[model samples]
Target chain A: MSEWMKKGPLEWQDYIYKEVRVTASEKNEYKGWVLTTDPVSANIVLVNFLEDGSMSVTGIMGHAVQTVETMNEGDHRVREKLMHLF
Target chain B: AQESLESQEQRARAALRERYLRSLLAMVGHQVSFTLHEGVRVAAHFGATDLDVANFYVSQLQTPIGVQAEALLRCSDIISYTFKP
Candidate 1:
């Protein structure tokens, strides 16, 4: 397993609700708000808000992610919205 | 009150897993685009995934040659997938 996948759920929780930039294999990059990190597969679920009030979801495979850098901290407002999104 | 460290981990794991599962459910029957290794991309109707996340079952998978009515994609070959929510 990768180092990211080896981290426990508590560690993964730190990324939840935060805006992050994820670098995956093949130098692919993704930016969005962290929705949840699946403990089973270590996949990172991210949501992007568009100008039209719609949300786009992206799921990055755990094995493909090279790095996850936080761009902005999530506040209570976004946290609550994300909590109910699922 | 502070909960036990083990308990906290358990709760976090359960919550995270549940949210991921729920999102998977939402993707069912929706149009999904997957970015696979080697810069390959394909669009398909979301079906389901195994509990281990090892394989994804999809329908109408559009490929270079033609469209497959049903197919199983390996998680190992996929980098990411996108869908509207």
Candidate 2:
């Protein structure tokens, strides 16, 4: 498991609603809002808003995470919009 | 903000985890596509997963070779998995 995945719930909680860019072991990158990082497997759940009015859900497997960097603060209005869905 | 984490962070964790769990629940009985390492991709019917999120029990797993009646995909082998609600 990566060091990021080993973070406590409190640490993971801090990432919620923030924008982040995650680097994977394959050197692939993904950027989106920090919806939730599974406190169990540490899988980082990312959501992206699309132009089609549909959002994309992406999960970056915990084990594959190489690095995660915050790009910016979250869009509060959009974050609130998404949260009400579930 | 110093010693104790304050119940607030704990509450946040619970709410976030619940939402993540809800997403998993939303995937039940639905077809989920997984992207594995080396760019290998496969789609399977969602089943139950352990609390540890180690392995996923699935059915009708359409693979590059053949479909399996049932199989377990180690979460470690996957880079990501997605499904549309």
Candidate 3:
């Protein structure tokens, strides 16, 4: 298991709605805006809005996370797109 | 006091947990791709899983051998999965 899974429930909360990159075990790396972190499992929920108006999501198993990086904040576009998502 | 910090912690936990739960809900009925170790990969219709992601049920799971009407995917085996809506 990765250190990300060992984090407390309160931690990793700030990642919500922000653009971040999640690197998982076995060299799996995903990039998008964070939807949330599971307090129980520390799993990460990521989202991306495509030009076609559809959205894409990715989930990284907590135990499989190797690292979490804060790249940049999502623009208004992302916020606008996420208006009713969650 | 310290109590305030604890409350803040609780609030954060609740919101984060809720968001994650919603993500899991969003996954239902969507096609998802799971990437596992040993370079094994598969795509299937999203279904329900446990709190810790122990296992998830999938429908219309296609495999090289045949199409499975229903499948239970072991989340422990995959590194990550993707859902497009």
Strongest candidate by lDDT: 1
Worst 10 residues of 3 chain A by lDDT: A1-10
- State which docking tier applies to candidate 3: medium
The candidate, 1 or 2, that scores higher on lDDT is 1
In the range B5-80, model 2's lDDT, one tens digit per residue, is: 6666677667767877877877789788888888788999999888878998999999678989899999989998
Candidate no. 1 TM-score: 0.93
DockQ of 2: 0.53
Error of 3 at B22 (Å): 1.3
What fraction of the correct interface contacts does each predicted structure contain? 0.94, 0.48, 0.88
User: How many clashing pairs per prediction, in order?
Assistant: 0, 0, 0
Tell me each candidate's RMSD, in Å, in order.
1.6, 2.6, 2.0
Q: lDDT by residue for model 1 over B1-85, one digit each (tens)?
A: 8889999999999999998999999999999999999998999999999999999999999978998899999999999999996
Q: Model 2: which residue pairs collide?
A: none
**If scored against the real structure, what TM-score would every candidate get?**
0.93, 0.84, 0.88
Q: Local error of candidate 2 at A51, Å? A: 3.7
Interface RMSD of 2: 2.1
Cα RMSD for predicted model 2: 2.6
Candidate 2 lDDT over residue span A19-40, tens digit each: 8999986767888887788766
Top candidate by DockQ: 1
What lDDT does each candidate get?
Answer: 0.93, 0.81, 0.81
